[PDB]
Amino acid sequence: RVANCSAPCPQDWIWHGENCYLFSSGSFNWEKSQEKCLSLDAKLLKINSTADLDFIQQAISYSSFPFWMGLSRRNPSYPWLWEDGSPLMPHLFRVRGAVSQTYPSGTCAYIQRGAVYAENCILAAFSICQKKANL
Amino acid sequence: SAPCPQDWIWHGENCYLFSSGSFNWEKSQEKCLSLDAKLLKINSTADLDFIQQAISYSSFPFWMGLSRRNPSYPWLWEDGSPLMPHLFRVRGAVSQTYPSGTCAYIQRGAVYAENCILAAFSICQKKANL
């Protein structure tokens, strides 16, 4: 039961800093991508520092695909919030794009080619999960 | 004692790494050795599946440790072992002779034959500390 050595991260994940990262298998709407990470006892990507940003941009340099992050905005009236209920801080980046009240279930942000964008949560895209590294 | 270093992908008995630059087969092999690794070697259908998963989101060609001098030589990995019969089927330029031989790479889930002289990204692998 108590770990013989215990790896920082599970197999197929990527270890960097105090975190483990897992790249989605395919395209799913935001709500589902969220369910996928929660089921693994993790969460959607939350960039909380420059090092995280550097790592992700590099780990996603090989792709042109959109990767959902755990950031959403119910509608224009509301603010951009991460999954843990905390606000979006300025310094890191800006989410360009539309926040439409016609969108069925709010607006969600994704990362693609280094820049962050806004989109109808209902659409499908790849995602990135994250958990603290086992140390 | 961590299985693999940061940025590597721990899967089964090994660690895996996507290269930072696009080079010819020779230079790519040099780069993997420099990292105490070798070019990717697929020992089964499970290896291949894991690879495609990791490369799903990319349309780039990734060199692997498979090659031969010309169509008269069979496909062999760097270590000398042959290509297992039922793993995959190498497509593309399989009937040509290149001064620097024909090398293989994975792109879009499929394996192709190409002039070793050409550029491509690569996948390096090494044993994990278990």
The owner of tokens 């008995």 is B13
State phi, psi for B103 to the nearest 5 degrees.
-120, 160
| DSSP characters over A38-65 | HHTT-EE----SHHHHHHHHHHTTT---
What are A28's two structure tokens?
Answer: 């799913």
Counting every residue written for chain B, the total comes to 130
Counting every residue written for chain A, the total comes to 135
Let me know: does B64 contact B42? Beta carbons within 8 Å.
yes
B4 contacts on A by Cβ (under 8 Å)? 15
* Shortest distance, CA A54 to any CA of chain B (angstroms): 12
B58 contacts on A by Cβ (under 8 Å)? 62-63
Distance, in Å, from the CA atom of B42 to the CA atom of B51, rounded to the nearest integer, reads 9
> In this complex, is the C-beta atom of A89 within 8 Å of any C-beta atom belonging to chain B?
no
Distance, in Å, from the CA atom of A105 to the CA atom of A97, rounded to the nearest integer, reads 16
Distance, in Å, from the CA atom of B17 to the CA atom of A75, rounded to the nearest integer, reads 40
Reference B102, options B63, B127, B70; nearest CA is B70
What are A126's two structure tokens?
Answer: 């790849």
Q: Which domains does chain B have, with CATH numbers?
A: 1-130 (3.10.100.10)
As beta bridge partners, residue B82 has B76
Among left, alpha and beta (phi > 0; psi -120 to 50; other), residue B52 is alpha
Query: Exposed, middle or buried: residue A85 (CB in 10 Å: 0-12, 13-18, 19+)?
Result: exposed
Distance, in Å, from the CA atom of A99 to the CA atom of A63, rounded to the nearest integer, reads 25
Distance, in Å, from the CA atom of B38 to the CA atom of A40, rounded to the nearest integer, reads 32
SS3 per residue for A20-33: EEEECCCCEEHHHH
Determination technique used: X-ray
Q: Do B9 and A14 touch (CB under 8 A)?
A: yes
What are B118's two structure tokens?
Answer: 């050409």
Distance, in Å, from the CA atom of A35 to the CA atom of A94, rounded to the nearest integer, reads 26
Distance, in Å, from the CA atom of B18 to the CA atom of A82, rounded to the nearest integer, reads 30
What are B125's two structure tokens?
Answer: 């692998």
State phi, psi for B97 to the nearest 5 degrees.
-120, 125
> In this complex, is the C-beta atom of A62 within 8 Å of any C-beta atom belonging to chain B?
yes
Q: Enter the resolution in angstroms.
A: 2.4
